[PDB]
């Protein structure tokens, strides 16, 4: 779980994910671990975006997180 989270953090902090690396990462780890790592990455991403949005809607990273989810 620690290793897969370390990998999926690097995956999340990026745009235009290369299919090959994503497939290799999925094959490397177990189903529960890959799902849980995706969940952890999204949770910490949203927490960081909300923390950076203390003042208000100005400069909101949530659009970046949502776009990453779409990619």
Backbone atoms as SQL, in Angstrom:
CREATE TABLE atoms (id INTEGER PRIMARY KEY, chain TEXT, resi INTEGER, resn TEXT, atom TEXT, x REAL, y REAL, z REAL);
INSERT INTO atoms VALUES
  (1, 'A', 1, 'UNK', 'N', 0.824, -1.202, 0.000),
  (2, 'A', 1, 'UNK', 'CA', 0.000, 0.000, 0.000),
  (3, 'A', 1, 'UNK', 'C', 0.859, 1.253, 0.000),
  (4, 'A', 2, 'UNK', 'N', 1.921, 1.267, 0.807),
  (5, 'A', 2, 'UNK', 'CA', 2.810, 2.425, 0.831),
  (6, 'A', 2, 'UNK', 'C', 3.433, 2.666, -0.540),
  (7, 'A', 3, 'UNK', 'N', 3.938, 1.603, -1.170),
  (8, 'A', 3, 'UNK', 'CA', 4.567, 1.755, -2.481),
  (9, 'A', 3, 'UNK', 'C', 3.561, 2.206, -3.538),
  (10, 'A', 4, 'UNK', 'N', 2.368, 1.610, -3.536),
  (11, 'A', 4, 'UNK', 'CA', 1.358, 1.965, -4.525),
  (12, 'A', 4, 'UNK', 'C', 0.866, 3.390, -4.326),
  (13, 'A', 5, 'UNK', 'N', 0.744, 3.833, -3.073),
  (14, 'A', 5, 'UNK', 'CA', 0.381, 5.219, -2.808),
  (15, 'A', 5, 'UNK', 'C', 1.474, 6.157, -3.295),
  (16, 'A', 6, 'UNK', 'N', 2.741, 5.799, -3.071),
  (17, 'A', 6, 'UNK', 'CA', 3.837, 6.620, -3.575),
  (18, 'A', 6, 'UNK', 'C', 3.770, 6.751, -5.092),
  (19, 'A', 7, 'UNK', 'N', 3.431, 5.662, -5.784),
  (20, 'A', 7, 'UNK', 'CA', 3.322, 5.726, -7.241),
  (21, 'A', 7, 'UNK', 'C', 2.107, 6.535, -7.693),
  (22, 'A', 8, 'UNK', 'N', 0.953, 6.338, -7.054),
  (23, 'A', 8, 'UNK', 'CA', -0.260, 7.003, -7.514),
  (24, 'A', 8, 'UNK', 'C', -0.262, 8.483, -7.148),
  (25, 'A', 9, 'UNK', 'N', 0.521, 8.900, -6.149),
  (26, 'A', 9, 'UNK', 'CA', 0.701, 10.332, -5.924),
  (27, 'A', 9, 'UNK', 'C', 1.412, 10.987, -7.099),
  (28, 'A', 10, 'UNK', 'N', 2.465, 10.346, -7.609),
  (29, 'A', 10, 'UNK', 'CA', 3.142, 10.853, -8.797),
  (30, 'A', 10, 'UNK', 'C', 2.197, 10.836, -9.989),
  (31, 'A', 11, 'UNK', 'N', 1.380, 9.788, -10.099),
  (32, 'A', 11, 'UNK', 'CA', 0.423, 9.705, -11.199),
  (33, 'A', 11, 'UNK', 'C', -0.600, 10.837, -11.132),
  (34, 'A', 12, 'UNK', 'N', -1.108, 11.124, -9.932),
  (35, 'A', 12, 'UNK', 'CA', -2.152, 12.127, -9.790),
  (36, 'A', 12, 'UNK', 'C', -1.670, 13.539, -10.061),
  (37, 'A', 13, 'UNK', 'N', -0.450, 13.861, -9.632),
  (38, 'A', 13, 'UNK', 'CA', 0.090, 15.200, -9.837),
  (39, 'A', 13, 'UNK', 'C', 0.621, 15.347, -11.256),
  (40, 'A', 14, 'UNK', 'N', -0.214, 15.033, -12.244),
  (41, 'A', 14, 'UNK', 'CA', 0.187, 15.096, -13.640),
  (42, 'A', 14, 'UNK', 'C', -1.061, 15.145, -14.507),
  (43, 'A', 15, 'UNK', 'N', -0.857, 15.506, -15.769),
  (44, 'A', 15, 'UNK', 'CA', -1.916, 15.558, -16.764),
  (45, 'A', 15, 'UNK', 'C', -1.489, 14.739, -17.976),
  (46, 'A', 16, 'UNK', 'N', -2.482, 14.212, -18.696),
  (47, 'A', 16, 'UNK', 'CA', -2.258, 13.337, -19.847),
  (48, 'A', 16, 'UNK', 'C', -1.466, 12.096, -19.432),
  (49, 'A', 17, 'UNK', 'N', -2.100, 11.286, -18.581),
  (50, 'A', 17, 'UNK', 'CA', -1.467, 10.072, -18.083),
  (51, 'A', 17, 'UNK', 'C', -1.185, 9.129, -19.243),
  (52, 'A', 18, 'UNK', 'N', 0.049, 8.644, -19.316),
  (53, 'A', 18, 'UNK', 'CA', 0.427, 7.709, -20.368),
  (54, 'A', 18, 'UNK', 'C', -0.245, 6.366, -20.100),
  (55, 'A', 19, 'UNK', 'N', -0.992, 5.817, -21.062),
  (56, 'A', 19, 'UNK', 'CA', -1.656, 4.527, -20.823),
  (57, 'A', 19, 'UNK', 'C', -0.715, 3.421, -20.378),
  (58, 'A', 20, 'UNK', 'N', 0.493, 3.353, -20.941),
  (59, 'A', 20, 'UNK', 'CA', 1.384, 2.231, -20.661),
  (60, 'A', 20, 'UNK', 'C', 1.796, 2.194, -19.195),
  (61, 'A', 21, 'UNK', 'N', 2.221, 3.337, -18.652),
  (62, 'A', 21, 'UNK', 'CA', 2.628, 3.379, -17.251),
  (63, 'A', 21, 'UNK', 'C', 1.456, 3.070, -16.331),
  (64, 'A', 22, 'UNK', 'N', 0.266, 3.574, -16.666),
  (65, 'A', 22, 'UNK', 'CA', -0.914, 3.286, -15.858),
  (66, 'A', 22, 'UNK', 'C', -1.226, 1.795, -15.848),
  (67, 'A', 23, 'UNK', 'N', -1.150, 1.146, -17.012),
  (68, 'A', 23, 'UNK', 'CA', -1.429, -0.285, -17.076),
  (69, 'A', 23, 'UNK', 'C', -0.380, -1.079, -16.309),
  (70, 'A', 24, 'UNK', 'N', 0.894, -0.692, -16.422),
  (71, 'A', 24, 'UNK', 'CA', 1.931, -1.386, -15.662),
  (72, 'A', 24, 'UNK', 'C', 1.710, -1.229, -14.163),
  (73, 'A', 25, 'UNK', 'N', 1.300, -0.036, -13.725),
  (74, 'A', 25, 'UNK', 'CA', 1.032, 0.177, -12.307),
  (75, 'A', 25, 'UNK', 'C', -0.170, -0.632, -11.836),
  (76, 'A', 26, 'UNK', 'N', -1.209, -0.733, -12.667),
  (77, 'A', 26, 'UNK', 'CA', -2.368, -1.547, -12.307),
  (78, 'A', 26, 'UNK', 'C', -1.979, -3.016, -12.201),
  (79, 'A', 27, 'UNK', 'N', -1.186, -3.507, -13.156),
  (80, 'A', 27, 'UNK', 'CA', -0.768, -4.905, -13.125),
  (81, 'A', 27, 'UNK', 'C', 0.172, -5.193, -11.962),
  (82, 'A', 28, 'UNK', 'N', 0.952, -4.198, -11.535),
  (83, 'A', 28, 'UNK', 'CA', 1.935, -4.425, -10.480),
  (84, 'A', 28, 'UNK', 'C', 1.272, -4.772, -9.153),
  (85, 'A', 29, 'UNK', 'N', 0.177, -4.101, -8.813),
  (86, 'A', 29, 'UNK', 'CA', -0.427, -4.215, -7.495),
  (87, 'A', 29, 'UNK', 'C', -1.791, -4.891, -7.563),
  (88, 'A', 30, 'UNK', 'N', -2.236, -5.363, -6.401),
  (89, 'A', 30, 'UNK', 'CA', -3.486, -6.096, -6.284),
  (90, 'A', 30, 'UNK', 'C', -4.689, -5.172, -6.454),
  (91, 'A', 31, 'UNK', 'N', -5.853, -5.790, -6.680),
  (92, 'A', 31, 'UNK', 'CA', -7.067, -5.029, -6.967),
  (93, 'A', 31, 'UNK', 'C', -7.477, -4.163, -5.781),
  (94, 'A', 32, 'UNK', 'N', -7.512, -4.748, -4.582),
  (95, 'A', 32, 'UNK', 'CA', -7.852, -3.954, -3.409),
  (96, 'A', 32, 'UNK', 'C', -6.842, -2.834, -3.207),
  (97, 'A', 33, 'UNK', 'N', -5.558, -3.126, -3.424),
  (98, 'A', 33, 'UNK', 'CA', -4.525, -2.122, -3.210),
  (99, 'A', 33, 'UNK', 'C', -4.592, -1.018, -4.255),
  (100, 'A', 34, 'UNK', 'N', -4.855, -1.364, -5.518),
  (101, 'A', 34, 'UNK', 'CA', -4.943, -0.328, -6.544),
  (102, 'A', 34, 'UNK', 'C', -6.158, 0.564, -6.301),
  (103, 'A', 35, 'UNK', 'N', -7.302, -0.033, -5.949),
  (104, 'A', 35, 'UNK', 'CA', -8.490, 0.767, -5.667),
  (105, 'A', 35, 'UNK', 'C', -8.254, 1.664, -4.460),
  (106, 'A', 36, 'UNK', 'N', -7.672, 1.108, -3.395),
  (107, 'A', 36, 'UNK', 'CA', -7.454, 1.880, -2.180),
  (108, 'A', 36, 'UNK', 'C', -6.427, 2.983, -2.402),
  (109, 'A', 37, 'UNK', 'N', -5.412, 2.725, -3.229),
  (110, 'A', 37, 'UNK', 'CA', -4.429, 3.756, -3.539),
  (111, 'A', 37, 'UNK', 'C', -5.057, 4.894, -4.329),
  (112, 'A', 38, 'UNK', 'N', -5.923, 4.567, -5.292),
  (113, 'A', 38, 'UNK', 'CA', -6.644, 5.617, -6.006),
  (114, 'A', 38, 'UNK', 'C', -7.503, 6.430, -5.045),
  (115, 'A', 39, 'UNK', 'N', -8.175, 5.744, -4.116),
  (116, 'A', 39, 'UNK', 'CA', -9.017, 6.429, -3.142),
  (117, 'A', 39, 'UNK', 'C', -8.197, 7.368, -2.265),
  (118, 'A', 40, 'UNK', 'N', -7.046, 6.898, -1.779),
  (119, 'A', 40, 'UNK', 'CA', -6.183, 7.725, -0.937),
  (120, 'A', 40, 'UNK', 'C', -5.676, 8.930, -1.713),
  (121, 'A', 41, 'UNK', 'N', -5.242, 8.714, -2.956),
  (122, 'A', 41, 'UNK', 'CA', -4.737, 9.821, -3.757),
  (123, 'A', 41, 'UNK', 'C', -5.807, 10.884, -3.956),
  (124, 'A', 42, 'UNK', 'N', -7.029, 10.467, -4.299),
  (125, 'A', 42, 'UNK', 'CA', -8.107, 11.435, -4.479),
  (126, 'A', 42, 'UNK', 'C', -8.439, 12.153, -3.177),
  (127, 'A', 43, 'UNK', 'N', -8.473, 11.419, -2.061),
  (128, 'A', 43, 'UNK', 'CA', -8.814, 12.039, -0.786),
  (129, 'A', 43, 'UNK', 'C', -7.796, 13.102, -0.397),
  (130, 'A', 44, 'UNK', 'N', -6.504, 12.781, -0.499),
  (131, 'A', 44, 'UNK', 'CA', -5.487, 13.762, -0.135),
  (132, 'A', 44, 'UNK', 'C', -5.445, 14.917, -1.129),
  (133, 'A', 45, 'UNK', 'N', -5.713, 14.646, -2.411),
  (134, 'A', 45, 'UNK', 'CA', -5.787, 15.730, -3.385),
  (135, 'A', 45, 'UNK', 'C', -6.894, 16.711, -3.029),
  (136, 'A', 46, 'UNK', 'N', -8.075, 16.195, -2.682),
  (137, 'A', 46, 'UNK', 'CA', -9.194, 17.073, -2.353),
  (138, 'A', 46, 'UNK', 'C', -8.921, 17.820, -1.053),
  (139, 'A', 47, 'UNK', 'N', -8.312, 17.146, -0.071),
  (140, 'A', 47, 'UNK', 'CA', -7.972, 17.827, 1.175),
  (141, 'A', 47, 'UNK', 'C', -6.989, 18.967, 0.936),
  (142, 'A', 48, 'UNK', 'N', -5.957, 18.730, 0.124),
  (143, 'A', 48, 'UNK', 'CA', -5.005, 19.790, -0.187),
  (144, 'A', 48, 'UNK', 'C', -5.667, 20.930, -0.952),
  (145, 'A', 49, 'UNK', 'N', -6.546, 20.610, -1.905),
  (146, 'A', 49, 'UNK', 'CA', -7.234, 21.656, -2.655),
  (147, 'A', 49, 'UNK', 'C', -8.119, 22.499, -1.748),
  (148, 'A', 50, 'UNK', 'N', -8.829, 21.859, -0.814),
  (149, 'A', 50, 'UNK', 'CA', -9.671, 22.605, 0.114),
  (150, 'A', 50, 'UNK', 'C', -8.834, 23.449, 1.066),
  (151, 'A', 51, 'UNK', 'N', -7.682, 22.928, 1.497),
  (152, 'A', 51, 'UNK', 'CA', -6.797, 23.708, 2.355),
  (153, 'A', 51, 'UNK', 'C', -6.264, 24.935, 1.626),
  (154, 'A', 52, 'UNK', 'N', -5.900, 24.779, 0.351),
  (155, 'A', 52, 'UNK', 'CA', -5.412, 25.908, -0.431),
  (156, 'A', 52, 'UNK', 'C', -6.519, 26.894, -0.780),
  (157, 'A', 53, 'UNK', 'N', -7.781, 26.523, -0.559),
  (158, 'A', 53, 'UNK', 'CA', -8.929, 27.364, -0.869),
  (159, 'A', 53, 'UNK', 'C', -9.511, 28.024, 0.379),
  (160, 'A', 54, 'UNK', 'N', -8.658, 28.359, 1.349),
  (161, 'A', 54, 'UNK', 'CA', -9.156, 28.907, 2.601),
  (162, 'A', 54, 'UNK', 'C', -9.852, 30.244, 2.431),
  (163, 'A', 55, 'UNK', 'N', -9.291, 31.120, 1.597),
  (164, 'A', 55, 'UNK', 'CA', -9.880, 32.438, 1.420),
  (165, 'A', 55, 'UNK', 'C', -11.246, 32.394, 0.762),
  (166, 'A', 56, 'UNK', 'N', -11.393, 31.582, -0.275),
  (167, 'A', 56, 'UNK', 'CA', -12.657, 31.489, -0.987),
  (168, 'A', 56, 'UNK', 'C', -12.440, 30.919, -2.380),
  (169, 'A', 57, 'UNK', 'N', -13.434, 31.141, -3.239),
  (170, 'A', 57, 'UNK', 'CA', -13.430, 30.559, -4.571),
  (171, 'A', 57, 'UNK', 'C', -12.284, 31.004, -5.456),
  (172, 'A', 58, 'UNK', 'N', -11.574, 32.064, -5.077),
  (173, 'A', 58, 'UNK', 'CA', -10.421, 32.507, -5.846),
  (174, 'A', 58, 'UNK', 'C', -9.350, 31.422, -5.865),
  (175, 'A', 59, 'UNK', 'N', -8.820, 31.147, -7.057),
  (176, 'A', 59, 'UNK', 'CA', -7.748, 30.172, -7.252),
  (177, 'A', 59, 'UNK', 'C', -8.108, 28.821, -6.630),
  (178, 'A', 60, 'UNK', 'N', -9.124, 28.177, -7.214),
  (179, 'A', 60, 'UNK', 'CA', -9.642, 26.918, -6.691),
  (180, 'A', 60, 'UNK', 'C', -9.031, 25.739, -7.440),
  (181, 'A', 61, 'UNK', 'N', -8.231, 24.893, -6.789),
  (182, 'A', 61, 'UNK', 'CA', -7.681, 23.705, -7.456),
  (183, 'A', 61, 'UNK', 'C', -8.682, 22.591, -7.734),
  (184, 'A', 62, 'UNK', 'N', -9.908, 22.659, -7.202),
  (185, 'A', 62, 'UNK', 'CA', -10.844, 21.551, -7.383),
  (186, 'A', 62, 'UNK', 'C', -11.123, 21.271, -8.851),
  (187, 'A', 63, 'UNK', 'N', -11.078, 22.298, -9.699),
  (188, 'A', 63, 'UNK', 'CA', -11.232, 22.063, -11.129),
  (189, 'A', 63, 'UNK', 'C', -10.090, 21.211, -11.667),
  (190, 'A', 64, 'UNK', 'N', -8.869, 21.437, -11.175),
  (191, 'A', 64, 'UNK', 'CA', -7.741, 20.615, -11.601),
  (192, 'A', 64, 'UNK', 'C', -7.921, 19.163, -11.171),
  (193, 'A', 65, 'UNK', 'N', -8.387, 18.940, -9.940),
  (194, 'A', 65, 'UNK', 'CA', -8.623, 17.578, -9.463),
  (195, 'A', 65, 'UNK', 'C', -9.710, 16.905, -10.290),
  (196, 'A', 66, 'UNK', 'N', -10.794, 17.632, -10.566),
  (197, 'A', 66, 'UNK', 'CA', -11.881, 17.072, -11.358),
  (198, 'A', 66, 'UNK', 'C', -11.401, 16.720, -12.761),
  (199, 'A', 67, 'UNK', 'N', -10.605, 17.604, -13.369),
  (200, 'A', 67, 'UNK', 'CA', -10.066, 17.335, -14.697),
  (201, 'A', 67, 'UNK', 'C', -9.132, 16.133, -14.681),
  (202, 'A', 68, 'UNK', 'N', -8.331, 15.989, -13.622),
  (203, 'A', 68, 'UNK', 'CA', -7.481, 14.811, -13.497),
  (204, 'A', 68, 'UNK', 'C', -8.327, 13.546, -13.435),
  (205, 'A', 69, 'UNK', 'N', -9.446, 13.601, -12.711),
  (206, 'A', 69, 'UNK', 'CA', -10.342, 12.450, -12.653),
  (207, 'A', 69, 'UNK', 'C', -10.905, 12.138, -14.037),
  (208, 'A', 70, 'UNK', 'N', -11.266, 13.172, -14.804),
  (209, 'A', 70, 'UNK', 'CA', -11.742, 12.933, -16.170),
  (210, 'A', 70, 'UNK', 'C', -10.666, 12.319, -17.059),
  (211, 'A', 71, 'UNK', 'N', -9.419, 12.782, -16.947),
  (212, 'A', 71, 'UNK', 'CA', -8.352, 12.183, -17.752),
  (213, 'A', 71, 'UNK', 'C', -8.157, 10.720, -17.376);
